[PDB]
């Protein structure tokens, strides 16, 4: 087979499925390289799960995402949640648990909503 791991990300009404399989180090999003995720201001919102943990961890796996639903900003937040959950879940599966821990400490200390859903469930006051 292939070593392969699927994760999911989610903001207001977007969704984003990441398949991470071990390969040579490419990152694509809806069939285009990540360096053209579109709104162009928030490209660094998408790049921050890469540049918080250094590029090499992505030099050795092939992350490939698909989103749908929502608008511009929502699809940005779904992509980066899916990528971050993808990288830490693959690391727990097919490398060591220690590096799972170091990854998740990095992403959580910077921004916990790389990993947990930011659900603004209502409140009756």
């Amino acid at each position: 087979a292939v070593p392969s791991v699927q994760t999911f990300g989610k903001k207001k009404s977007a969704t984003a499925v990441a398949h991470v399989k071990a390969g040579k180090g490419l990152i694509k999003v809806n069939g285009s390289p990540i360096t053209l995720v579109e709104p162009e201001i928030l490209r660094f919102k998408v790049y921050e799960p890469l540049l918080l943990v250094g590029l090499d961890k992505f030099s050795n796996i092939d992350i490939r995402v698909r989103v749908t639903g929502g608008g511009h900003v929502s699809q940005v937040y779904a992509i980066r949640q899916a990528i971050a959950k993808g990288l830490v879940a693959y690391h727990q599966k097919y490398v060591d648990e220690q590096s799972k821990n170091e990854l998740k400490k990095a992403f959580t200390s910077y921004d916990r909503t790389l990993l947990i859903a930011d659900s603004r469930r209502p409140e009756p006051k």
């Binding site: 791991v5 699927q6 994760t7 999911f8 959950k85 830490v88 879940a89 693959y90 727990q92 599966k93 990993l115």
Partner: peptide, 8 residues
């Protein structure tokens, strides 16, 4: 088709 391996 809803596995999410972050949950394992």
């Amino acid at each position: 088709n809803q596995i999410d391996d972050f949950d394992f």
